[PDB]
Design a protein around this ligand. Sequence first.
Ligand SMILES: Cc1cc2nc3c(=O)[nH]c(=O)nc-3n(C[C@H](O)[C@H](O)[C@H](O)COP(=O)(O)OP(=O)(O)OC[C@H]3O[C@@H](n4cnc5c(N)ncnc54)[C@H](O)[C@@H]3O)c2cc1C
Length: 295
Amino acid sequence: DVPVNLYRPNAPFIGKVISNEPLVKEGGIGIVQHIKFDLTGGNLKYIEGQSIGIIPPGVDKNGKPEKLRLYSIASTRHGDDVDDKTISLCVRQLEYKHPESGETVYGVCSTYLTHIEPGSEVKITGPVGKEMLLPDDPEANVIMLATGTGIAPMRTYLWRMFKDAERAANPEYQFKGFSWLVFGVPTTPNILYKEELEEIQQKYPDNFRLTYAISREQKNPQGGRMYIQDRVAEHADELWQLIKNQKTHTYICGLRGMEEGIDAALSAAAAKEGVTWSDYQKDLKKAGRWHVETF
Ligand SMILES: Cc1cc2nc3c(=O)[nH]c(=O)nc-3n(C[C@H](O)[C@H](O)[C@H](O)COP(=O)(O)OP(=O)(O)OC[C@H]3O[C@@H](n4cnc5c(N)ncnc54)[C@H](O)[C@@H]3O)c2cc1C
């Protein structure tokens, strides 16, 4: 049912870049690009919450061909133009410290992607993943906890739930539950898809709540920079109350590091009702209602 591995690294799909557009506004930190690829001429199909591989050109330091890197799909199954002809990624250029030979170091696949020109051919594999899938139940509640490019699967969910053209294209999924995105980035310019996310909340105030953790602009009650775990702590009781619903699904995506604080917050909330969160969570995971993709 769920499409997987329609293309594999040994014979990847050769897609063409359609567009490569910046998502970080001026005054933001780093580079994050929205890259749309043409799928025509191949049979790559995918659904929300899946990933694809990109095989960058060139050899590694040892002279071996570069292997694929996985990227969360950022578009619904229909693509950004709701035409079933494209796929989009949300790619941060990896950039880091002196402590790794030279000065600034640039990630191979992410630099390739963020600097790629429209018209260029790209080697695409996949799709991959069954752990971040959205329920077909239109009355499900969906909690989304994202940092940085972790927004990508959330965008696929929210566009499917809330975009006019998606609703028109998906007769069987007219979302009427409650979705809550807690999104952590360093700056307001770094709020990926800010305008569209805010448009959704304005349009669907009873079906979508948008919460930001903006680390360079907000402080947690301890005086530290605000991160998503601080927002989870702040709204722990409400989040736990929602999680108790048989139809609630939670999705976590982004760089590793926040799950521990998220667990501590939810544990304190659940303990008030004599529930051990770690146990409840194990059962949620088994039932397919606790979805984590951290990298
Ligand atoms: C399921 C999944 C989904 C993903 N989705 C996305 C996505 O949507 N968007 C996105 O941008 N990325 C995503 N990634 C990460 C992506 O796959 C790549 O790992 C990332 O883009 C960097 O790859 P690269 O080739 O540019 O860097 P590489 O050239 O492969 O370098 C990576 C290496 O650099 C070193 N390194 C990395 N960070 C540091 C640091 N801070 N300090 C010191 N050394 C460091 C580590 O040794 C690491 O092995 C996802 C990963 C997975 C597994």
